Design a protein around this motif. Sequence first.
Motif, mmCIF file in Angstrom:
data_model
loop_
_atom_site.group_PDB
_atom_site.id
_atom_site.type_symbol
_atom_site.label_atom_id
_atom_site.label_comp_id
_atom_site.label_asym_id
_atom_site.label_seq_id
_atom_site.Cartn_x
_atom_site.Cartn_y
_atom_site.Cartn_z
ATOM 1 N N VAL A 126 0.853 -1.176 0.000
ATOM 2 C CA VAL A 126 0.000 0.000 0.000
ATOM 3 C C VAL A 126 0.892 1.230 0.000
ATOM 4 C CG1 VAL A 126 -1.745 1.316 1.202
ATOM 5 C CG2 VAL A 126 -1.908 -1.175 1.057
ATOM 6 N N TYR A 127 0.687 2.088 -0.993
ATOM 7 C CA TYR A 127 1.346 3.380 -1.054
ATOM 8 C C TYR A 127 0.445 4.380 -0.342
ATOM 9 C CZ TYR A 127 4.099 7.312 -2.862
ATOM 10 O OH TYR A 127 4.875 8.448 -2.941
ATOM 11 N N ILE A 128 0.981 5.034 0.675
ATOM 12 C CA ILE A 128 0.251 6.048 1.430
ATOM 13 C C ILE A 128 0.893 7.391 1.113
ATOM 14 C CG2 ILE A 128 -0.523 6.856 3.663
ATOM 15 C CD1 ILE A 128 -0.327 4.049 4.751
ATOM 16 N N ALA A 129 0.151 8.251 0.418
ATOM 17 C CA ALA A 129 0.569 9.635 0.198
ATOM 18 C C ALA A 129 -0.003 10.497 1.316
ATOM 19 C CB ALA A 129 0.083 10.130 -1.166
ATOM 20 N N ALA A 130 0.868 11.117 2.117
ATOM 21 C CA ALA A 130 0.441 11.853 3.301
ATOM 22 C C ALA A 130 1.007 13.265 3.295
ATOM 23 C CB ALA A 130 0.853 11.124 4.607
ATOM 24 N N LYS A 131 0.278 14.165 3.955
ATOM 25 C CA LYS A 131 0.585 15.588 3.962
ATOM 26 C C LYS A 131 0.153 16.178 5.293
ATOM 27 C CE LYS A 131 -0.367 19.684 1.014
ATOM 28 N NZ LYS A 131 -0.981 19.987 -0.315
ATOM 29 N N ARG A 132 0.918 17.153 5.783
ATOM 30 C CA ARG A 132 0.476 17.937 6.930
ATOM 31 C C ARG A 132 -0.667 18.862 6.524
ATOM 32 N NH1 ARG A 132 5.561 16.761 6.773
ATOM 33 N NH2 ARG A 132 6.837 16.477 8.673
ATOM 34 N N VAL A 133 -1.787 18.766 7.238
ATOM 35 C CA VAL A 133 -2.924 19.669 7.089
ATOM 36 C C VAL A 133 -3.368 20.067 8.493
ATOM 37 C CG1 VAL A 133 -5.253 20.027 6.195
ATOM 38 C CG2 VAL A 133 -3.648 18.555 4.927
ATOM 39 N N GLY A 135 -1.798 20.794 11.226
ATOM 40 C CA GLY A 135 -1.144 20.116 12.327
ATOM 41 C C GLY A 135 -1.375 18.622 12.416
ATOM 42 N N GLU A 136 -1.934 17.994 11.378
ATOM 43 C CA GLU A 136 -2.208 16.563 11.382
ATOM 44 C C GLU A 136 -1.749 15.955 10.066
ATOM 45 O OE1 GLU A 136 -6.569 17.363 12.350
ATOM 46 O OE2 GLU A 136 -6.122 15.702 13.721
ATOM 47 N N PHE A 137 -1.226 14.731 10.119
ATOM 48 C CA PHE A 137 -0.886 14.030 8.888
ATOM 49 C C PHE A 137 -2.158 13.435 8.304
ATOM 50 C CE2 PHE A 137 3.383 13.517 10.986
ATOM 51 C CZ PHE A 137 4.106 14.267 10.059
ATOM 52 N N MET A 138 -2.453 13.787 7.058
ATOM 53 C CA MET A 138 -3.642 13.294 6.382
ATOM 54 C C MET A 138 -3.281 12.431 5.179
ATOM 55 S SD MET A 138 -6.061 15.275 8.107
ATOM 56 C CE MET A 138 -7.374 16.130 7.241
ATOM 57 N N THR A 141 -5.495 11.009 -1.933
ATOM 58 C CA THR A 141 -5.686 10.065 -3.025
ATOM 59 C C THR A 141 -5.683 10.825 -4.356
ATOM 60 O OG1 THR A 141 -8.034 10.155 -2.481
ATOM 61 C CG2 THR A 141 -6.799 8.287 -1.637
ATOM 62 N N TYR A 142 -5.835 10.087 -5.454
ATOM 63 C CA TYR A 142 -5.899 10.666 -6.798
ATOM 64 C C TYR A 142 -4.635 11.475 -7.096
ATOM 65 C CZ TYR A 142 -10.616 8.958 -6.818
ATOM 66 O OH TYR A 142 -11.711 8.123 -6.758
ATOM 67 N N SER A 143 -3.500 10.782 -7.048
ATOM 68 C CA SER A 143 -2.214 11.404 -7.374
ATOM 69 C C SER A 143 -1.921 12.605 -6.474
ATOM 70 C CB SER A 143 -2.166 11.792 -8.855
ATOM 71 O OG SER A 143 -2.194 10.621 -9.648
ATOM 72 N N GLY A 144 -2.197 12.445 -5.184
ATOM 73 C CA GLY A 144 -1.899 13.464 -4.202
ATOM 74 C C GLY A 144 -2.803 14.676 -4.208
ATOM 75 N N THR A 145 -3.977 14.610 -4.852
ATOM 76 C CA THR A 145 -4.813 15.796 -5.027
ATOM 77 C C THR A 145 -6.052 15.854 -4.150
ATOM 78 O OG1 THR A 145 -6.188 14.867 -6.824
ATOM 79 C CG2 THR A 145 -4.116 15.976 -7.436
ATOM 80 N N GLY A 149 -9.616 13.372 4.250
ATOM 81 C CA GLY A 149 -9.989 13.562 5.638
ATOM 82 C C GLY A 149 -9.674 12.396 6.548
ATOM 83 N N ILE A 150 -8.943 11.396 6.054
ATOM 84 C CA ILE A 150 -8.539 10.243 6.850
ATOM 85 C C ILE A 150 -7.173 10.524 7.449
ATOM 86 C CG2 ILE A 150 -7.907 7.804 6.769
ATOM 87 C CD1 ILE A 150 -9.900 7.610 4.345
ATOM 88 N N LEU A 151 -7.043 10.303 8.756
ATOM 89 C CA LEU A 151 -5.770 10.522 9.434
ATOM 90 C C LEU A 151 -4.777 9.423 9.079
ATOM 91 C CD1 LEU A 151 -6.933 11.511 13.046
ATOM 92 C CD2 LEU A 151 -6.058 13.067 11.282
#
Length: 262
Positions: A126-133, A135-138, A141-145, A149-151
């Motif tokens: 499983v590839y998980i693309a995550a970003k700070r939003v 103060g939380e890592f979110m 999906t869809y090529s990082g776009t 809303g899933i932590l």
Amino acid sequence: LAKRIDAALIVKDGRVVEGSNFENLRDSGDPVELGKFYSEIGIDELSFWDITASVEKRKTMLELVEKVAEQIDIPFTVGGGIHDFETASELILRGADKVEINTAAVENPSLITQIAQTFGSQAVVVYIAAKRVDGEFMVFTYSGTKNTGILLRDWVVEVEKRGAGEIVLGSIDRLGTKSGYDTEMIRFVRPLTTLPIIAHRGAGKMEHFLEAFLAGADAAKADSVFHFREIDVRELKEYLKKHGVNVRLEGLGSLEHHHHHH
């Protein structure tokens, strides 16, 4: 404590997107020859990530998997828009060691379990693309776009529960950067799962791989930094071994034209 160095190739219509700087190759944009080159210099595993747009994607990826398995002996993963069990099944049966899912698994985590039930957990990445939003890592999906809303902390736990074999942790906050892997994100995930964690995005120099392994990554994946020769794979493994990292070196050796061998 054993660590893995992986190379990833982004492919579109059987071509390496933006190519490589290995002019020793007959076709520096051919993913099979580039992949075989990497397996000969010391890459441990390959990822082929397809972004073929139009209606030819499924046939294009099956053809790639067919050619890769016939010429390449190290394990490889296929990924990029694999959306259901039958697509993933076809690709494994055609020769892929592992299939990677992302958006389809986030939307339908049962897919993880379905693949693992037939082919074993070790076939599922499983590839998980995550970003700070805020103060939380979110999870995106869809090529990082798409912000799902899933932590990240919840999804990592669910991914292991559903039966994935390993997680590729790609920091969108490092997309295209060269200042280092997202070691804070790696450290955040490490206590949450027993699965192998593969760091992705941010690698710019050899020391960044050491940092990622000190953060708890089991493997480090890179693409452009290898393709455009900012980092030499053998030099990287020698550097890591010198500073105490358990990388695979004895299985290599013949790259300095040492006499002859019939």
